[PDB]
Protein backbone atom coordinates (compact mmCIF):
# COMPACT_ATOMS: atom_id res chain seq x y z
CA UNK A 1 0.00 0.00 0.00
CA UNK A 2 1.26 3.02 -1.07
CA UNK A 3 -0.45 5.06 1.98
CA UNK A 4 1.51 2.63 4.38
CA UNK A 5 4.40 4.37 3.75
CA UNK A 6 3.05 7.25 4.04
CA UNK A 7 4.54 8.59 8.06
CA UNK A 8 1.51 9.22 9.83
CA UNK A 9 0.18 13.06 9.77
CA UNK A 10 0.65 14.85 13.33
CA UNK A 11 -2.81 14.85 14.12
CA UNK A 12 -3.15 10.70 13.64
CA UNK A 13 0.26 10.26 15.43
CA UNK A 14 -0.70 12.24 18.15
CA UNK A 15 -4.21 10.29 18.86
CA UNK A 16 -2.30 7.23 18.08
CA UNK A 17 -0.22 8.18 21.31
CA UNK A 18 -3.24 9.34 23.55
CA UNK A 19 -4.48 5.81 23.05
CA UNK A 20 -1.44 3.79 23.87
CA UNK A 21 -0.15 6.04 26.42
CA UNK A 22 -2.85 4.60 28.32
CA UNK A 23 -1.87 0.67 27.77
CA UNK A 24 1.10 1.07 28.67
CA UNK A 25 0.00 2.44 31.72
CA UNK A 26 -2.78 0.24 32.19
CA UNK A 27 -0.48 -3.04 31.69
CA UNK A 28 1.20 -2.72 34.86
CA UNK A 29 -0.67 -4.42 37.37
CA UNK A 30 -3.94 -6.29 37.75
CA UNK A 31 -6.27 -6.08 34.40
CA UNK A 32 -4.28 -5.12 31.28
CA UNK A 33 -7.10 -2.94 30.17
CA UNK A 34 -7.47 -0.99 32.98
CA UNK A 35 -5.95 2.00 35.45
CA UNK A 36 -5.75 0.51 38.92
CA UNK A 37 -5.63 3.84 41.45
CA UNK A 38 -2.08 3.24 41.49
CA UNK A 39 -1.19 3.02 37.63
CA UNK A 40 -3.33 6.30 37.21
CA UNK A 41 -1.23 7.69 39.67
CA UNK A 42 2.22 7.26 37.94
CA UNK A 43 0.27 7.95 34.41
CA UNK A 44 -0.60 11.67 36.45
CA UNK A 45 2.96 11.72 37.77
CA UNK A 46 4.99 10.75 34.55
CA UNK A 47 3.15 11.84 31.70
CA UNK A 48 0.46 14.86 32.70
CA UNK A 49 2.59 16.65 35.53
CA UNK A 50 1.76 19.94 34.31
CA UNK A 51 -1.64 19.65 32.49
CA UNK A 52 -2.61 18.69 36.03
CA UNK A 53 -0.19 20.19 37.72
CA UNK A 54 -3.68 21.92 40.54
CA UNK A 55 -5.60 18.75 40.06
CA UNK A 56 -5.07 18.65 44.09
CA UNK A 57 -5.94 15.12 45.69
CA UNK A 58 -5.52 12.42 42.86
CA UNK A 59 -7.29 10.43 45.38
CA UNK A 60 -10.30 11.84 44.87
CA UNK A 61 -9.62 12.39 41.28
CA UNK A 62 -9.51 8.64 40.50
CA UNK A 63 -13.07 8.64 42.07
CA UNK A 64 -14.57 11.04 40.14
CA UNK A 65 -13.27 9.56 36.66
CA UNK A 66 -14.70 5.90 38.37
CA UNK A 67 -17.78 6.33 37.26
CA UNK A 68 -19.05 3.30 37.36
CA UNK A 69 -17.40 2.58 40.80
CA UNK A 70 -15.90 -0.81 40.25
CA UNK A 71 -12.12 0.70 41.20
CA UNK A 72 -10.59 0.76 38.49
CA UNK A 73 -10.37 3.47 34.90
CA UNK A 74 -11.35 1.50 32.18
CA UNK A 75 -10.46 3.22 28.82
CA UNK A 76 -13.77 5.33 28.15
CA UNK A 77 -13.20 6.63 31.45
CA UNK A 78 -9.43 7.49 30.73
CA UNK A 79 -11.11 9.25 27.70
CA UNK A 80 -13.89 11.48 29.49
CA UNK A 81 -10.11 12.87 31.24
CA UNK A 82 -8.25 13.76 28.35
CA UNK A 83 -11.64 15.43 26.94
CA UNK A 84 -11.13 17.52 30.74
CA UNK A 85 -7.85 18.40 29.74
CA UNK A 86 -8.51 19.01 25.68
CA UNK A 87 -11.30 21.80 27.16
CA UNK A 88 -8.94 23.31 29.63
CA UNK A 89 -6.48 23.81 26.83
CA UNK A 90 -9.01 24.64 24.19
CA UNK A 91 -9.43 27.42 26.75
CA UNK A 92 -5.87 28.60 26.91
CA UNK A 93 -6.82 30.20 23.38
CA UNK B 1 10.73 26.20 30.84
CA UNK B 2 8.84 22.60 32.43
CA UNK B 3 8.78 21.40 28.83
CA UNK B 4 5.75 19.46 28.21
CA UNK B 5 5.39 15.35 28.05
CA UNK B 6 4.63 13.18 24.83
CA UNK B 7 1.00 12.89 26.38
CA UNK B 8 0.52 16.34 26.68
CA UNK B 9 2.16 17.57 23.85
CA UNK B 10 0.17 14.72 21.89
CA UNK B 11 -3.46 16.53 23.57
CA UNK B 12 -2.27 19.81 22.65
CA UNK B 13 -2.09 19.06 19.01
CA UNK B 14 -5.17 17.20 18.77
CA UNK B 15 -6.69 20.77 19.83
CA UNK B 16 -4.54 23.63 18.05
CA UNK B 17 -5.75 21.35 15.00
CA UNK B 18 -9.34 21.79 15.44
CA UNK B 19 -7.99 25.80 15.54
CA UNK B 20 -5.80 25.69 12.50
CA UNK B 21 -8.49 24.41 10.49
CA UNK B 22 -11.57 26.82 12.28
CA UNK B 23 -10.01 30.30 11.31
CA UNK B 24 -9.67 29.47 7.55
CA UNK B 25 -13.83 30.81 6.74
CA UNK B 26 -16.53 31.78 8.74
CA UNK B 27 -16.30 31.61 12.47
CA UNK B 28 -12.99 31.47 13.58
CA UNK B 29 -14.23 28.79 16.31
CA UNK B 30 -16.00 26.33 14.25
CA UNK B 31 -15.18 24.19 11.19
CA UNK B 32 -17.85 24.74 7.84
CA UNK B 33 -18.34 21.95 5.71
CA UNK B 34 -14.91 23.05 3.77
CA UNK B 35 -12.65 23.44 6.38
CA UNK B 36 -13.98 19.79 7.97
CA UNK B 37 -13.10 18.62 4.64
CA UNK B 38 -9.39 19.99 4.60
CA UNK B 39 -8.78 18.71 8.12
CA UNK B 40 -9.71 15.32 7.13
CA UNK B 41 -8.12 15.10 3.66
CA UNK B 42 -4.66 17.00 5.03
CA UNK B 43 -4.60 15.37 8.89
CA UNK B 44 -6.82 12.32 8.65
CA UNK B 45 -5.93 11.03 5.37
CA UNK B 46 -4.88 7.50 6.93
CA UNK B 47 -7.79 7.45 10.29
CA UNK B 48 -10.36 8.19 7.69
CA UNK B 49 -9.45 6.81 4.44
CA UNK B 50 -12.25 4.79 4.25
CA UNK B 51 -14.75 7.45 4.86
CA UNK B 52 -17.23 7.62 2.54
CA UNK B 53 -18.62 11.10 1.54
CA UNK B 54 -17.30 13.44 3.76
CA UNK B 55 -20.43 15.79 3.28
CA UNK B 56 -22.52 12.90 4.95
CA UNK B 57 -20.27 12.25 7.56
CA UNK B 58 -20.14 16.51 8.38
CA UNK B 59 -23.66 15.78 8.69
CA UNK B 60 -23.32 12.72 11.05
CA UNK B 61 -21.04 14.71 13.45
CA UNK B 62 -23.34 18.16 12.89
CA UNK B 63 -25.55 16.70 15.76
CA UNK B 64 -26.82 20.44 16.42
CA UNK B 65 -27.31 20.83 12.76
CA UNK B 66 -26.26 24.31 12.44
CA UNK B 67 -23.54 23.20 9.82
CA UNK B 68 -20.85 24.11 11.59
CA UNK B 69 -18.86 21.78 13.58
CA UNK B 70 -18.05 23.45 17.35
CA UNK B 71 -14.97 21.88 18.83
CA UNK B 72 -17.41 19.30 21.26
CA UNK B 73 -18.44 17.95 17.98
CA UNK B 74 -14.68 17.47 16.53
CA UNK B 75 -13.87 16.20 19.77
CA UNK B 76 -16.74 13.47 19.46
CA UNK B 77 -15.19 12.52 16.13
CA UNK B 78 -11.82 12.03 17.62
CA UNK B 79 -12.99 10.08 20.50
CA UNK B 80 -14.64 7.49 17.17
CA UNK B 81 -11.10 7.40 15.71
CA UNK B 82 -9.37 7.27 19.27
CA UNK B 83 -11.84 4.17 20.08
CA UNK B 84 -10.97 2.54 16.49
CA UNK B 85 -6.98 2.62 17.43
CA UNK B 86 -7.93 0.78 21.04
CA UNK B 87 -9.51 -2.08 19.37
CA UNK B 88 -5.84 -2.43 17.25
CA UNK B 89 -3.52 -1.90 20.64
CA UNK B 90 -5.64 -4.14 22.57
CA UNK B 91 -6.48 -7.42 20.28
CA UNK B 92 -8.63 -10.24 21.96
CA UNK B 93 -7.16 -13.42 21.11
CA1 LIG C 1 -3.99 -2.49 35.08
CA1 LIG D 1 -14.32 2.31 36.43
CA1 LIG E 1 -14.53 28.43 10.43
CA1 LIG F 1 -22.87 21.91 14.95
Do not use: C
Request: overall charge negative.
Amino acid sequence: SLMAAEPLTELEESIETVVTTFFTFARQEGRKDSLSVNEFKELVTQQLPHLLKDVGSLDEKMKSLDVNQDSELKFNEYWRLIGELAKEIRKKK
